Amino acid sequence: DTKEQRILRYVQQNAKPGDPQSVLEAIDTYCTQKEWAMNVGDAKGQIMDAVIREYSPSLVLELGAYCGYSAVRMARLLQPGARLLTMEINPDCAAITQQMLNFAGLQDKVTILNGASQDLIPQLKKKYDVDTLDMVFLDHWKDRYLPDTLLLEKCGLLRKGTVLLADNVIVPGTPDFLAYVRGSSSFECTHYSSYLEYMKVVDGLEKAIYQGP
């Protein structure tokens, strides 16, 4: 089996069904004690939580689900009726994410879209009945952060106040995205310095709030 399957099984055997906090703990324990994996982790997760609680978004888009750690993190804090759409290119990971959300009891809040962001973003309005997004979590290929931000704007999916929150802007890093949003009058940006998941290595989140054209 794969590392991702082992993380899912560990959750199934060491967390409580329907308890998202126990799911997060189990993943963080496994990834600390057994095998590193690219979940956002607890250090950066705490900053995500604070952001989610500040904005109480009704409709969140996530690029890059992986095993569902960030989707569980965000969905557990959503208000009733609020929704998360998460896009995952790897079908094995899409299936693990679905099972992770099922175990956590969050499946009614989250729709896991298996496919590439550059193919799926243009379908959001018509296919998934999206008007505009309240928040976007970027956690996919680091060289896609900038092109997908520009694609989101092109598609009319951003509104005044839409919050972009971007993982890994330091490690592995997303230099073009950071330079673009930080230099654009269409974004108000804040950096939240933290640590790479499960490591004593500096990383951070970028929050970039869209201001309109």
Ligand SMILES: O=C(NCCCCc1cc2ccncc2s1)c1cc(-c2ccc(F)cc2)cc(O)c1O
């Ligand atoms: O690559 C990372 N994350 C993206 C995986 C790409 C998955 C995709 C999902 C999807 C959905 C839709 N369209 C297209 C795509 S492409 C990543 C890597 C590290 C890291 C840090 C230090 C290391 F030494 C080694 C890895 C840490 C992280 O937190 C990451 O998130």
Ligand SMILES: [Cl-]
């Ligand atoms: Cl994650």
Ligand SMILES: [Cl-]
């Ligand atoms: Cl961590």
Ligand SMILES: [Mg+2]
């Ligand atoms: Mg990441």
